[PDB]
């Protein structure tokens, strides 16, 4: 089964500020509301696109739309726990790629690790990885690994006790992507795009020591569906429409004359197809691969506040 | 000391107006203001704010509005509505009091020593005897009834 | 939401027309104006999962 | 730095800074057979400085 | 003109006192410009060499640490450095920079070579500094004579 969700909102302008505001430097003959509603009209379009991307990313991150009452932009206090069928979204990894057990040597070969996943899915064709999308600090984890390093040394001839002093971390990290791509065969895409936290600093969308693992295809995983909303009538018959709508109610001629804008739509995301043998979905999985990755990263400017 | 570095002069903050439920309806009547009230610190600040007003039922100042003393049961019994996003108190002395609207609880403070954009706990505590109905984090009031 | 001002008309207005210093007469001077617009560059939109 | 001339006795600088409000604030959640809810208030601000 | 100019360049502070050369009139000026953080901190410098022979701070890593910590501070990453005379002789005795020189020429000391003297070991200390930090280096070894002591830079 499948059934969508509903969300809409509104905003009103009373009678004082419609004809009692101009600019602040000069004098203006009361038409600045037309400038300020036109921005506030465009802003409500930017809300419905922002709500869609929240629902969409909530599936990609957990496979669980959870909406609690005590929540931002839930004044109505609604409970929703929408469980999709994403099976084993967290890949197990009890020791990170930067564990460094003992003196200087790490404990996990990551090039062997992802290749171990490819070998274990020769007869599970919906389950071998094809590509990985990571945040910024992925090569810094690989260059300090003591397993990956021996792969870098092998393709160039670097025995350390002879032939060369051990190289600096410039060349030792510049070749770290391609040796990961040649010996695991899969693709790596970097998504370094950011956002600013409420109390905290600037954060990344894909978090710092985490990555996603795309299985058998890198195409679209799921679908976002718009369902029907009651538009007006046309010839006495109710007409319907899908997608985000924006209705305008001008009460500019009554005794407290006002003006309102209402925006919303109906919808929910939907996953495309499950496995017909045993009903399992595994197209994206999350891997917490390291811990101290923020130590490899430049700081961010604090937000300037006038 | 022959060079001054940059220091700021102007500080302008432009907020938006107090939101209210579109579908609940408006009813507002202009009342005269009490001259004994210092109306400067009630309309002070760029923040969105509402506040309750009472009315003198008799005496030499009858029909004049003043902000509601929540510690006085007589001023609680004479409440008439809210002032939403206060007007020019200096050029005019006749305020439009809203008698019927639906306002979120974050925009109504009685004390001057009350932070903006936060619920006033004195208003929430006296909301039974202020004829206020708190539903979904919003005050519902109508003083025509 | 931008504050409804004029940019050019406010820089020419926040300056005193009737100010004298410790010297009892108006002095010669020279004024350069500058305008800055402050936006958070590091709060970006999650445009990744449109393609997914 | 090179040298310059001004024929004046004082130089003053004015800076005007603007800060708009961001288009954030996801969306409020609804049920099909009920009424809408209002949207919060934002803030924009400007400062100006002198040297 | 040059004295006031170098007084800004060195301290960001024009300070004129009464007991001063070429101020017979006894005037007072303390002119504080708005220079923020004029001194970079470095508690162990580059030739500390704590322990047996190994030093403590890598200048190739230190001046790369500064460029990394100003990727979103575009007015704050370094572009060039202007130095006095003896900068190569600090780099050649550093035991971190030395391994950069050995790497680009294949000088493993146990095999292939006995360790060279400081001739070419310092002659390539500029280019290996310029390539791995990416910044420019200008040398300004111009001198003046002090009132009392010897010739200063």
Author numbering:
A (entry chain F): 104 to 409
B (entry chain N): 2 to 146
C (entry chain F): 1 to 52
D (entry chain A): 53 to 103
E (entry chain A): 155 to 307
Please give the exact wording used by the authors of the publication that reports this structure.
Capsids are protein shells that surround and protect the viral genome. Tailed bacteriophages, as well as herpesviruses, use Major Capsid Proteins of the conserved HK97 fold. MCP adopts the expected HK97 fold. The HK97 fold has two globular domains: the rectangular P-domain (peripheral domain; residues 107–186, and 326–373) and the triangle-shaped A-domain (axial domain; residues 192–320, and 384–391).
We extracted capsid particles from the raw images and performed single particle reconstruction imposing icosahedral symmetry. The resolution of the reconstruction is 2.8 or 3.1 Å according to gold standard 0.143 or 0.5 Fourier Shell Correlation (FSC) criteria. The capsid exhibits T = 7 (laevo) symmetry, which is surprising for a capsid of this size. The larger size of the T = 7 capsid is due to much larger and flatter capsomers than found in other Caudoviruses. We observe conformational heterogeneity among the seven copies of MCP in the asymmetric unit that is restricted to the E-loop and N-arm. A series of lassos topologically tether subunits together to stabilize the capsid. In this manner, the E-loop acts as a lasso to topologically attach to the next subunit within the capsomer. Thus, the elbows form twofold flaps on the capsid exterior to stabilize the twofold and quasi-twofold axes, while the T-loop forms tongue-in-groove interactions on the capsid interior to stabilize the threefold and quasi-threefold axes. The decoration protein forms a unique cage to lock the mature capsid in place.
